[PDB]
Structure formats: structure tokens, C-alpha cells
Design an enzyme around this catalytic site. Structure first.
Site, PDB file in Angstrom:
ATOM      1  N   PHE A   1      -8.302   5.675  -0.452  1.00  0.00           N
ATOM      2  CA  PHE A   1      -7.433   6.204   0.540  1.00  0.00           C
ATOM      3  C   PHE A   1      -5.962   5.951   0.124  1.00  0.00           C
ATOM      4  O   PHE A   1      -5.613   4.818  -0.001  1.00  0.00           O
ATOM      5  CB  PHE A   1      -7.743   5.423   1.844  1.00  0.00           C
TER       6      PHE A   1
ATOM      7  N   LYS B   1       2.138   0.564  -0.106  1.00  0.00           N
ATOM      8  CA  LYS B   1       0.866   1.266   0.065  1.00  0.00           C
ATOM      9  C   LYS B   1       1.111   2.420   1.038  1.00  0.00           C
ATOM     10  O   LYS B   1       1.574   2.225   2.156  1.00  0.00           O
ATOM     11  CB  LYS B   1      -0.251   0.372   0.576  1.00  0.00           C
TER      12      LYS B   1
ATOM     13  N   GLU C   1       4.515  -7.783  -0.973  1.00  0.00           N
ATOM     14  CA  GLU C   1       5.026  -8.397  -2.179  1.00  0.00           C
ATOM     15  C   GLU C   1       4.405  -7.737  -3.409  1.00  0.00           C
ATOM     16  O   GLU C   1       3.247  -7.450  -3.446  1.00  0.00           O
ATOM     17  CB  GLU C   1       4.784  -9.883  -2.201  1.00  0.00           C
TER      18      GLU C   1
ATOM     19  N   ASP D   1     -14.505  -6.528   1.120  1.00  0.00           N
ATOM     20  CA  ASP D   1     -14.235  -5.703  -0.062  1.00  0.00           C
ATOM     21  C   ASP D   1     -13.834  -6.520  -1.294  1.00  0.00           C
ATOM     22  O   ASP D   1     -12.965  -6.145  -2.011  1.00  0.00           O
ATOM     23  CB  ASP D   1     -13.273  -4.535   0.210  1.00  0.00           C
TER      24      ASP D   1
ATOM     25  N   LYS E   1     -13.765  -7.706  -4.870  1.00  0.00           N
ATOM     26  CA  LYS E   1     -14.050  -7.125  -6.180  1.00  0.00           C
ATOM     27  C   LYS E   1     -12.821  -7.279  -7.070  1.00  0.00           C
ATOM     28  O   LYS E   1     -11.717  -7.416  -6.548  1.00  0.00           O
ATOM     29  CB  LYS E   1     -14.432  -5.655  -6.116  1.00  0.00           C
TER      30      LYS E   1
ATOM     31  N   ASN F   1      -9.486  -5.561  -6.393  1.00  0.00           N
ATOM     32  CA  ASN F   1      -8.673  -5.890  -5.222  1.00  0.00           C
ATOM     33  C   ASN F   1      -8.136  -7.310  -5.322  1.00  0.00           C
ATOM     34  O   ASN F   1      -7.634  -7.893  -4.370  1.00  0.00           O
ATOM     35  CB  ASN F   1      -9.453  -5.792  -3.911  1.00  0.00           C
TER      36      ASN F   1
ATOM     37  N   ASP G   1      -5.761  -5.472  -0.258  1.00  0.00           N
ATOM     38  CA  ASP G   1      -6.697  -4.556   0.346  1.00  0.00           C
ATOM     39  C   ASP G   1      -7.544  -5.115   1.509  1.00  0.00           C
ATOM     40  O   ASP G   1      -8.664  -5.495   1.345  1.00  0.00           O
ATOM     41  CB  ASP G   1      -7.587  -3.856  -0.679  1.00  0.00           C
TER      42      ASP G   1
ATOM     43  N   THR H   1     -18.219  -1.862  -1.554  1.00  0.00           N
ATOM     44  CA  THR H   1     -18.402  -1.294  -2.889  1.00  0.00           C
ATOM     45  C   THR H   1     -19.822  -1.565  -3.340  1.00  0.00           C
ATOM     46  O   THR H   1     -20.242  -2.728  -3.269  1.00  0.00           O
ATOM     47  CB  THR H   1     -17.359  -1.910  -3.829  1.00  0.00           C
TER      48      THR H   1
HETATM   49  N1  LIG Z   1       0.812  -6.077  -3.768  1.00  0.00           N
HETATM   50  C1  LIG Z   1       0.498  -5.338  -4.812  1.00  0.00           C
HETATM   51  N2  LIG Z   1       1.118  -5.440  -5.977  1.00  0.00           N
HETATM   52  C2  LIG Z   1       0.817  -4.697  -7.007  1.00  0.00           C
HETATM   53  N3  LIG Z   1      -0.138  -3.809  -7.035  1.00  0.00           N
HETATM   54  C3  LIG Z   1      -0.909  -3.611  -5.966  1.00  0.00           C
HETATM   55  C4  LIG Z   1      -0.617  -4.379  -4.752  1.00  0.00           C
HETATM   56  N4  LIG Z   1      -1.488  -3.985  -3.841  1.00  0.00           N
HETATM   57  C5  LIG Z   1      -2.234  -3.044  -4.403  1.00  0.00           C
HETATM   58  N5  LIG Z   1      -1.900  -2.816  -5.659  1.00  0.00           N
HETATM   59  C6  LIG Z   1      -2.535  -1.838  -6.555  1.00  0.00           C
HETATM   60  O1  LIG Z   1      -2.883  -0.684  -5.839  1.00  0.00           O
HETATM   61  C7  LIG Z   1      -4.279  -0.561  -5.772  1.00  0.00           C
HETATM   62  C8  LIG Z   1      -4.718  -0.024  -4.432  1.00  0.00           C
HETATM   63  O2  LIG Z   1      -4.466  -0.925  -3.380  1.00  0.00           O
HETATM   64  P1  LIG Z   1      -5.509  -1.095  -2.229  1.00  0.00           P
HETATM   65  O3  LIG Z   1      -4.888  -1.853  -1.188  1.00  0.00           O
HETATM   66  O4  LIG Z   1      -6.673  -1.673  -2.884  1.00  0.00           O
HETATM   67  O5  LIG Z   1      -5.882   0.401  -1.809  1.00  0.00           O
HETATM   68  P2  LIG Z   1      -7.323   0.944  -1.309  1.00  0.00           P
HETATM   69  O6  LIG Z   1      -7.525   0.228  -0.048  1.00  0.00           O
HETATM   70  O7  LIG Z   1      -7.237   2.412  -1.095  1.00  0.00           O
HETATM   71  O8  LIG Z   1      -8.245   0.531  -2.374  1.00  0.00           O
HETATM   72  C9  LIG Z   1      -4.855  -1.921  -6.127  1.00  0.00           C
HETATM   73  O9  LIG Z   1      -6.190  -1.927  -6.594  1.00  0.00           O
HETATM   74  C10 LIG Z   1      -3.821  -2.367  -7.140  1.00  0.00           C
HETATM   75  O10 LIG Z   1      -4.048  -1.767  -8.385  1.00  0.00           O
HETATM   76 MG   LIG Z   2      -9.778  -0.319   0.436  1.00  0.00          MG
HETATM   77 MG   LIG Z   3      -8.564  -1.400  -3.054  1.00  0.00          MG
END
Ligand SMILES: Nc1ncnc2c1ncn2[C@@H]1O[C@H](COP(=O)(O)OP(=O)(O)O)[C@@H](O)[C@H]1O
Ligand SMILES: [Mg+2]
Ligand SMILES: [Mg+2]
Lengths: 337, 20
Positions: free
Chosen positions: A41, A59, A108, A153, A155, A158, A171, A188
Site C-alpha cells: 500500500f 510514507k 525518522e 508483520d 519480517k 520491515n 510498518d 506475510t
Molecule cells: N523510517 C524509514 N526509513 C527509511 N526507510 C523506510 C522507513 N520506513 C519504511 N521505509 C522503507 O519503505 C518500505 C515500506 O514501508 P512500510 O511501512 O513497510 O510500507 P508497507 O506497509 O506498505 O509495507 C520499507 O520496507 C522500507 O524499505
Molecule cells: Mg504493511
Molecule cells: Mg512493509
């Protein structure tokens, strides 16, 4: 006095859970530089905050997509929980806001990249290296579970590595505040506990299953149940037979046997002594649990950093425009965001 | 080998969630 610390942590959380922060920034306070990762998403972008010059990870969730995948409640959960939690290995939500088209969670920026890429690149982690991270998840789940939160979640994708080489969990899209049982089939496939897969109703113990999957994958370099299709994976998980690499220590196999336990009455993290069965396991005998909480342990691995906005520890992604209609979308659905 | 079979498989990259 973990008891004492958790009690006041709960007070702090409940205050924010009950009166969540809202609308603490807006899109034009930031310059959008580069996509850091995509999820199922929405996408996470590296951005620069104009007035501070600070980098963040933004995000971005498209409201219509969130609705279409039936993630409204989950997304409200995500933000409500993230703004209220405080722990050394949980990523910090710095701002949140929304506009006509999108939801934004500004965290952050954790510049070390995903555990995932490091794990695939190196192949696998030594048992001390895996143990160092695992310890951090154990403590984190202790915290979250104490606040009645299920995470759901876990993995490598994340988990982020910071500039100190410590973990930052990110996440919370599937995180939920609940006492007792819930029913959502979500997560997952490689990480699903068999009671999720079997539509039983499940609890917090699914996070301890997932920890077992994580520790195995980190130390083996591949997961305990893999196949080409999800169906094939769920079959393996339900059947419950697990095989271990020849290099796994006896200690590690025994722990994993108690975590990847199909019998809830027997799964570690779940029983009488609770987390203590995990903290006190032989595999963790050399873990200094306080020193870890305190981040005084030297990390086995420190990513290379090349200053502020370096994204070299992340894969490249195709960029896309972030459109914001002149008409407001899903205003009611997301009012509390 | 187990490794060989994983590496040759279609699930060695970033994994999507389910909600299914
Ligand atoms: N605080 C952060 N700093 C750097 N990269 C991030 C951070 N949060 C997320 N990411 C990157 O973005 C991706 C997607 O974030 P996420 O929250 O996992 O989205 P989704 O819920 O759709 O999986 C992560 O797997 C990572 O690669
Ligand atoms: Mg997610
Ligand atoms: Mg994720």
C-alpha cells in the site's frame, strides 16, 4: 523492575492513545527526493524538511487505494498506535497529516536500509549476529504486548538498521490494540502462524511464532517454510515439520522448536513465565538484556553512511508523481487521522 | 541443497503481505 518500567510506559501510551496527535505538518513543508521502498500500500520517500533541513522518510498512502484494499481500519490503527508508542527499537513517527488525496506518516529516516537486503546480500547471519537482532525484537514484543498491541508483520523487509547498527521496527499497518482474540487473515505468508491460516481466532502468540520464523531466516538465510506459491507454504506450516541447517547449534534448534510450536499450550512467549521462557533460554545465555535495551552492546555490523541523505543502503525504485486532486476523497472515513 | 532450491524459487525478493 521491568514491571515498574512497563507500568509507566503504559500510562504514557494510554495518554496518547486516548488523545492522538493530529495534523502536525503539511506536504509543502517538505522536498520529496527519492523513493526508499514500496509496500503493498503506498510508498516511502526520502524527503527534506525545508525549515529544519532534516531528512525524513515520508510514507504516502493513497486514500482510494487504502479503501480499495479494505485497509481503512488498519490504517487508522497504524497511525493511532505509531504516534503513541515509545521504545528504543521502534521507529519514531515525527509528523502526520492528510490532504485531498493522501495520508502521510513522516518518520525518522533510518539510513542503514532493510535487514532484508543485508541478509540476502551476505547470505546469512552468524548466530551471535542474529541473536543481537533477535534480542531487540524480544524486548520490543514484550513492550508492545504489554500495551495490548499485536504487531503481526514481522519480517526482514520491515526491520531497518540504524546508524548504530541497531534495529528500528517499521510498518505498523497490521498492528492492533486488542485483548484476547482477533480474526483477520493478514500478514506475510512465510511468517503466518498456523492458527492464523486455519481461521481459528488467534492472539499475541502469533508474534512469537513469527519471531521463530525470523530467527530461522536470519541464521539460515532462507525461511523455515518456503515454496513457489502461498498455498504450498501454508501447507508446510500447518504440517509443522521443520528441518534445520547442519550448522545450526543445538541451542538454536531447541529454541526454534519451542517458538515454531504449533501447540499454543506449548509455544514459548505464550506460557506461564511469558517472555521469560525466551529471555532465559540457553540460546540467549550470553545476552545482556539490560545492555541491549540500553544500546551499550557493540553491533556486529555497522552500515556505511555517506552523510545526511545518503540512500545507498536502499534499492532504487521507479518514481511516480504524487497527485492531489482538487476534490477531497474519503473525508469521513479518515476524520480521526 | 535447500539453499539451491530457495535461491531458484520465486520468493527470494521482497515479499508482499496478504489480507487476502
Ligand atoms: N523510517 C524509514 N526509513 C527509511 N526507510 C523506510 C522507513 N520506513 C519504511 N521505509 C522503507 O519503505 C518500505 C515500506 O514501508 P512500510 O511501512 O513497510 O510500507 P508497507 O506497509 O506498505 O509495507 C520499507 O520496507 C522500507 O524499505
Ligand atoms: Mg504493511
Ligand atoms: Mg512493509
Amino acid at each position: 523492575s521491568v514491571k515498574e518500567f512497563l507500568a509507566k510506559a503504559k500510562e504514557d501510551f494510554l495518554k496518547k492513545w486516548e488523545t492522538p496527535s493530529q495534523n502536525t505538518a503539511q506536504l509543502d513543508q517538505f522536498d520529496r527526493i527519492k523513493t526508499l521502498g514500496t509496500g503493498s500500500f503506498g510508498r516511502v520517500m526520502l524527503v527534506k524538511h525545508k525549515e529544519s533541513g532534516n531528512h525524513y522518510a515520508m510514507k504516502i498512502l493513497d486514500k482510494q487505494k487504502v479503501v480499495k484494499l479494505k485497509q481503512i481500519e488498519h490504517t487508522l490503527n497504524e497511525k493511532r498506535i505509531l504516534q503513541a508508542v515509545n521504545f528504543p527499537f521502534l521507529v519514531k513517527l515525527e509528523f502526520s497529516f492528510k490532504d485531498n488525496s493522501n495520508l502521510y506518516m513522516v518518520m525518522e529516516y533510518v539510513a542503514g536500509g532493510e535487514m532484508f537486503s543485508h541478509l540476502r546480500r551476505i547470505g546469512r547471519f552468524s548466530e551471535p549476529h542474529a541473536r543481537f537482532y533477535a534480542a531487540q525484537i524480544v524486548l520490543t514484543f514484550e513492550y508492545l504486548h504489554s500495551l495490548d498491541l499485536i504487531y503481526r508483520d514481522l519480517k526482514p523487509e520491515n526491520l531497518l538498521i540504524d546508524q548504530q547498527g541497531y534495529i528500528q521496527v517499521t510498518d505498523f499497518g497490521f498492528a492492533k490494540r486488542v485483548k484476547g482474540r482477533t480474526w483477520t487473515l493478514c500478514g506475510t505468508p512465510e511468517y503466518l502462524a498456523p492458527e492464523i491460516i486455519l481461521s481459528k481466532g488467534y492472539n499475541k502468540a502469533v508474534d512469537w511464532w513469527a519471531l521463530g520464523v525470523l530467527i530461522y531466516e536470519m541464521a539460515a538465510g532462507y525461511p523455515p517454510f518456503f515454496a513457489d506459491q502461498p498455498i504450498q507454504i501454508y501447507e508446510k506450516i500447518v504440517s509443522g515439520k521443520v528441518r534445520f541447517p547442519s550448522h545450526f547449534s543445538s541451542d538454536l534448534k531447541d529454541l526454534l522448536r519451542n517458538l515454531l510450536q504449533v501447540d499454543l499450550t506449548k509455544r514459548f512467549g505464550n506460557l506461564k513465565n511469558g517472555v521469560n521462557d525466551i529471555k532465559n533460554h540457553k540460546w540467549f545465555a550470553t545476552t545482556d538484556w539490560i545492555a541491549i535495551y540500553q544500546r551499550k552492546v557493540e553491533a556486529p555490523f555497522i552500515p556505511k553512511f555517506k552523510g545526511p541523505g545518503d540512500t545507498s543502503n536502499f534499492d532504487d525504485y521507479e518514481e511516480e508523481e504524487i497527485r492531489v486532486s482538487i476534490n477531497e476523497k474519503c473525508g469521513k472515513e479518515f476524520t480521526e487521522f | 541443497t535447500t539453499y539451491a532450491d530457495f535461491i531458484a524459487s520465486g520468493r527470494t525478493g521482497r515479499r508482499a503481505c496478504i489480507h487476502d
